[PDB]
């Protein structure tokens, strides 16, 4: 839909859409920018992720409201409308997954980009798993696990334990273990080891890097407090 707009204009409009809290537009501009075929810079990768996380986040919140009403009720209307929201959510996740597969991951050679995209791949399969119930729910869970695991393997080899991508990957993989994979002990172990290894590396950081790493470490701690 965006093929006639310049890449740089799509990027500029995604930034304006974020400022205006127009996240559907933001996601469409960043999809158009990815489809230009060039690799994304760090800031552009964040724009793509912010846009889709906000769109899918609103869908997930709505699906949870509707699923709760449906479970309490158990005419066809609540199920029909939950199904409509669910299909829309699945379509957004499939769109993001398709961008990652065509061709962001295969062109990502640096650790920072490859880990970021594989974390995204894990996240969007995790959102598919949250609504899955059919013949492929196990398979969707394995797809999330596999993407997160490859990202973890690269991050542990190539990034320091305070790197914010590495920390956010570990946070989200721990949520996957707790909420999707029925592995609360693995979730707790991952969050604790990640927190402790980051703490031991904080001395190497500048003030601004310290603020970024400690912000994510606090999220790990908040989950550990909820889980223990």
């Amino acid at each position: 839909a965006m093929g006639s707009m310049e890449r740089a204009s799509l990027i500029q409009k995604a930034k304006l859409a974020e400022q205006a809290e127009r996240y559907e537009d933001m996601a469409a501009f960043m999809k158009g920018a990815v489809e230009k075929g060039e690799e994304l810079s760090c800031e552009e990768r964040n724009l793509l992720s912010v846009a889709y996380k906000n769109v899918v986040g609103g869908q997930r919140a709505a699906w949870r409201v509707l699923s709760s009403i449906e479970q309490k009720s158990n005419g066809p209307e609540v199920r029909e409308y939950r199904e409509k929201v669910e299909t829309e959510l699945q379509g957004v996740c499939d769109t993001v997954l398709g961008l990652l597969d065509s061709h962001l991951i295969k062109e990502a050679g640096d650790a920072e980009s490859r880990v970021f995209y594989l974390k995204m791949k894990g996240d969007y399969y995790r959102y598919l798993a949250e609504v899955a119930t059919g013949d492929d729910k196990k398979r969707i869970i394995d797809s999330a696990r596999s993407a997160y695991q490859e990202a973890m393997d690269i991050s542990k080899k190539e990034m320091p334990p305070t790197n914010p991508i590495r920390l956010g990957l570990a946070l989200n993989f721990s949520v996957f273990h707790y909420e999707i994979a029925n592995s609360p002990e693995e979730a707790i172990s991952l969050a604790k080891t990640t927190f402790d290894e980051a703490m031991a590396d904080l001395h190497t950081l500048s003030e601004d890097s310290y603020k970024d790493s400690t912000l994510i470490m606090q999220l790990l701690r908040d989950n550990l407090t909820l889980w223990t």
Binding site: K53, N54, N172, V175, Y178, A187, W227
Partner: peptide, 9 residues
Amino acid sequence: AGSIPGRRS
């Protein structure tokens, strides 16, 4: 359980 946000708040 909270997952990661995209932006510093």
